[PDB]
Write a protein that binds this ligand. Sequence first.
Ligand code: HEM
Ligand code: HEM
Lengths: 783, 788
Amino acid sequence: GIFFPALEQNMMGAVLINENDEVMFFNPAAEKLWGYKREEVIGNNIDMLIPRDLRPAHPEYIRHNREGGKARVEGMSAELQLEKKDGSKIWTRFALSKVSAEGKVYYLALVRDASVEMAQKEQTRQLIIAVDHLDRPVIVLDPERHIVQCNRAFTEMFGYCISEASGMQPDTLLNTPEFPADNRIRLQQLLWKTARDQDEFLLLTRTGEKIWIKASISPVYDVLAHLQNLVMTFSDITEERQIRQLEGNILAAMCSSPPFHEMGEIICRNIESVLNESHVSLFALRNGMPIHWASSSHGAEIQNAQSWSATIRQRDGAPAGILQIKTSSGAETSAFIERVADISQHMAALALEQEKSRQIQFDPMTGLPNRNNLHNYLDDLVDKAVSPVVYLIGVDHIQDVIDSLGYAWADQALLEVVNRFREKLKPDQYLCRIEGTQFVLVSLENDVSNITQIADELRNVVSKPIMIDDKPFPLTLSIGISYDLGKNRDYLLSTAHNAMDYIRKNGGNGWQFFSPAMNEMVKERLVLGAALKEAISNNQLKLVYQPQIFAETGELYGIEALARWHDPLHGHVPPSRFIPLAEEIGEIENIGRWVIAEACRQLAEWRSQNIHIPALSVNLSALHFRSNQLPNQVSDAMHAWGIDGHQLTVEITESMMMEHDTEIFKRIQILRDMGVGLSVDDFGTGFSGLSRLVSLPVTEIKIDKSFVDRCLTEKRILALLEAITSIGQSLNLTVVAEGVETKEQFEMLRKIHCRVIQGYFFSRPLPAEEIPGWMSSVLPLKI
Amino acid sequence: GIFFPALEQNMMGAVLINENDEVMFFNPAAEKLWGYKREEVIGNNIDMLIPRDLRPAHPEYIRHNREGGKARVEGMSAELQLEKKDGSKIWTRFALSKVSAEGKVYYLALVRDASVEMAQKEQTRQLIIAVDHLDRPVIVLDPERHIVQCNRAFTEMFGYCISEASGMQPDTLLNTPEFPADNRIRLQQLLWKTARDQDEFLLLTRTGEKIWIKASISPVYDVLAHLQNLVMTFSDITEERQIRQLEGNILAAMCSSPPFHEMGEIICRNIESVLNESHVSLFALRNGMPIHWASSSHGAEIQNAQSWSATIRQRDGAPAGILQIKTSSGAETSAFIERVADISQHMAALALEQEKSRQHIEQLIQFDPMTGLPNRNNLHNYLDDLVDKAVSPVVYLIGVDHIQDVIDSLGYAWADQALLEVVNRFREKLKPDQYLCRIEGTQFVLVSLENDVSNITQIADELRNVVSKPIMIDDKPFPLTLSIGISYDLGKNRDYLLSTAHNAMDYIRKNGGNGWQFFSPAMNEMVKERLVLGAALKEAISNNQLKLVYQPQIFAETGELYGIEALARWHDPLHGHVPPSRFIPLAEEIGEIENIGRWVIAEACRQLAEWRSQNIHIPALSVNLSALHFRSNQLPNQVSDAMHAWGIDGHQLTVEITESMMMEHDTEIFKRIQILRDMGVGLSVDDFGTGFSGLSRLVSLPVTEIKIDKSFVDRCLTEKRILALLEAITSIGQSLNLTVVAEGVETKEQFEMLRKIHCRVIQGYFFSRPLPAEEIPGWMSSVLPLKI
Ligand code: HEM
Ligand code: HEM
């Protein structure tokens, strides 16, 4: 029987009904839930307890129950509304039990006051407000830094729904692009920071888009100070970071007060970097009226263009300029555009303040002179009637340095550039710094060949990357050359800058003159060089041989081999012309090895009929023979053909003997070790040079055409020739002469006991043929 | 009874225990909750259901309740923690009953699973925490506009808590203004009409302050229509203007570029201006630790202030500073303080980047824009490099004296020009190893690598003589003077060098100027010695105290004497022997080279005229002009007078020239040597020169003979290419009628092998040390032709 007293003692409401729905038990909890009294809750069936409207449904329901046959009731499992005795309606929960005994079915109902519905509804309200009219990504974290609750804005922005965002840390949840250092490590630092903190990151959503966000941690502790949870805000600063980077770049601009138009340029390209595919224009108040300050390089039409005009205002509020922007409709949000407009307007006003706040003779950066020194120097050149060739050099691709590293490294790059220019500067060449990027190089040599060489040297001096702290920014040069006779300095500077700008705009990395005719003359020289390269490539050049003979018996001493080139398109062109051109092309080694190889082959070819050919001499000084060529360039020819090695001789000048390094000295020594005779020009530089001469057996000294010339006119050179022949006779050397054309020359030269003679007197240079004819016909010309 | 199956069939968890505290009822819900099958729980004690953490403290409460006998159990009114069979923990609610039946005590327990219930509870708590951290004040409303849920932003915006304004109508709590009828009517309509309104109104706080607020009522419409809930999102439209104002003002501070400390101060004062009462401090990180940058002067204590820490980040992102702001609690909400922290952090990072940029630019800026010489930083770098090279420098500190008077009198327009031509005169006498710098104003620095005092005094003398010609400015003379302090010490760092050099600078300046000095009496006594040595040398030249010592030279195969070479000497009663290699440089420094040259030539001519008395005697005589530093205005006149005053045929004497000075340069002493050749003086050379031009000048005017320096012949035996050079020289001499001579031949082997290559005359100790002038006629006719 204890069920009744226990149930009425229990604070859970209990109602008991029989098969006829008559009530037997109704606990005081049910009494206070309904308001009726047990003397009346019986009544007729269950009429009093049920709300009057739902009444008719209830019998059929329980009828269905006694027809259902199920041992469990799925009904009343949800929340329910109960009408009280006074007609008020409250929330409640029900539970049901069906029993069978004595052939009759009874039911018991348990009732609860439902104090949890207040919690459910309050939770629904704050679930509404966490999302509604607030696109504010907020997430919350456990002590283990696990996502516990995230709102609609966060799922919408970062694509990861709550089902796919829970149970894992935010960083592991987050797809992160590879900085690779910062945007990875600082995320972990912030996510594990214990105190309030914040940072900025670049992140990738589930759609692969790049965004910039700002993440803030602020933890919360319970009463006992243990860490309960953490809360994180996820503002999207991808538009704001553009504004902040705009600010940083523009400040790095005015840090050094560049010129006015330049300042407009930084403003404009920063705006363009901020507003994609737009147009920007600026005007400033000069003399009281608006005048154009700067504009963007873009000038194409804009579809659905929207224009905003902002009047620049100073601190006092007086107008100072107008900034105008045109943007396509739908490209950017309006609020972002207006924000950019006003912040840039403020910075333009500040730039104007700096400009009118700003408003000796050498450079305090690298030490080069400033524009005043160049002006004075050119003026001192002009008054005494000398034409200076003026190169204007503009350094290019510095904008990468300025944008990526500010000015404090652009000027370091400029210093490195100036060091490289000075390292190869020649004296009388004047280097000056005009302003910022530009330089002016002044040189008095008006030769086109030298000008081309200087320009090429400058262009290629910047070939190596400019190494600045493990960051090779490549830089280029744009050179404008001006040279005209009898023109003052302003014209030269103006045309130099015009040429520099022309090269820069068309792409840079190059050079150009101003005068058009000789700017085509350089092209024609390049054409000649192309023809010469073709000729040397397909071995068309020839070697004309000129004989030199003894002055006593007339027996053949030897014959020099001289390069010659006759072209169908260009005709005869002398070696004195196409050797300097060759070194301009820098292909002298080709001519050298071809000349050597062809001479060896020709000696072999002559050997098949007559071996009596005494000696063949190649003048390597006039051929501008380099240093490293000698060993291989002689050894390959020696071994390739049937030439012995004691028949062909090589000539070297004194400057090339022991100057411009000394590796060439032993490179000639090894060639002597091969056994090829040598020939020296001056043998000077004192007793050391003489020691080298005797130690390197030369066996023959040549007298240049000039000394033999005027030999019958100037007494000093006469005595010099006596000295030379006396020294030669003393040692084991045979002295040769060049440029002999008359009879008195030969007479006096033989009078001084000069051994052998060459020139036009005996034989005009015969071509590759009719040398055996000359040798068989008139070889013993006992004159 | 039917209640046993009833409780068997309730969703409720039914358990009953008897007096023996043994469980005798268990239901499917108990199966879900406890996890133990009824076959395991029936017959088990109540302690089975008790969790571990309370087992020792289980029964006493039930004893106590039994003793009390109260029907309404006070306990189990709270939440309970139950442990499952597998060890997991869940939360359950209990409903109890005490039964006194059949003369016994029974306890009935009913267990409900509130896992959903408390999950809802913690979800509510988490959501409260989350909504409180929203940057903007937001409120929920019921259909009749019950203010049901506010958040911390709304509390910190007005003052109301959840309990204070819980469902009590907004118009009554909002404390709307009474005077503006239009404002209050519009606000009431906004609260009432169910459109998406974004109107703005003035509202009042507990401090009686009128604040602009934008309401954003956006009612919700459920799926069943008949909208119920409304959502309000108040915003402050006066804080944003203040943030923009702070941005602009701090950027204007940026643009004038004050120094680091001034800018930090302006940042903090602006922040304090925004937040009515606050203290702001800034730390800039150096080497990982924070150096104080600036804090506002309002250092008064704040009662229960709230701090805020932001980590300033560099342009790349490396942390660079800490910013801490403290404001009195309740003055501003969390959002406004966080926003000002963010805006200020960006600008502080800008200031740090600008300061770093200026540090990098100034490290290499200012290399004397006026005259172009290197400036003090360049000098410090160069001296540091020299010290790292372990090479001791000599540093001159140079100061101009009279320039300050002209500055005081004629201003800068003359001083700048004067210093300009001073530097111009200096540069005309530099050297490749000499490095000039302009430390400051009218002070300069010269750096050299010469440690011999003989060179140092000469350098100082030419520098002093730079101003021998007074500066010409606008037809006006200005005789500026110099005061120079030299420092040179091994191992001392650069700072000591500059410090002591400036000490010597001051010492030689305040004494009157126009002078030079060392700083150490340990190196100044040398120059003090040298002045009197030079005075003695001048006295000796005047009184003719010197001596001439004769060394002969004889033939290499004949044995006869070819001639004699004249050498000069000095014996003094104080300093004793003093060699020519130490008093010809001294004669140079006094500029008495002309006098000693004249004395040697005149004495040689006198000896020849005296020796002609007995017989013809001497074949030929030589004087080394190169060793005597003879100048361009000394040869012809001195030789001509020497051989005119006495009687000399000219064939007797020869002069030796190093051929280095024989170059035309700017003197053209070719005419002088040609004149000397015309008057019969023999000539001697040592090298040919550049090339054919050199041989031409050697053979045009006939150089009688050529000498091999002692350096060559001292190494002839060891090296072969010396021998080749020797044979070449001898062959050239034979060819051109040149008389090769050798100086310094010592032993017999050298003489024999030089005879093998026909050197043809030998001069050295091997036949005679240089004898005094008197023993010679006692040697010409005693040792005789030496045919060894
Ligand atoms: C004022 C008190 C009551 C109200 C307002 C009420 C209301 C309802 C309602 C709305 C349903 C259908 C949906 C649902 O179950 O949630 C229902 C079902 C049912 N009720 Fe009641 N009820 C009350 C009392 C009782 C009592 C005391 C008993 C038996 C002792 C009972 C027996 C049943 C049965 C058997 C069903 C069928 C559930 C099914 O078929 O799934 N009801 N009741
Ligand atoms: C997981 C199982 C249980 C836990 C964790 C537990 C724990 C507690 C605790 C700590 C109290 C005292 C403080 C309070 O009520 O908030 C209490 C009250 C009480 N519980 Fe338990 N108990 C458990 C099971 C039981 C069982 C199985 C019974 C009886 C069949 C029982 C009977 C009582 C009684 C009589 C009181 C004191 C009532 C009063 O003083 O008014 N408890 N329970």
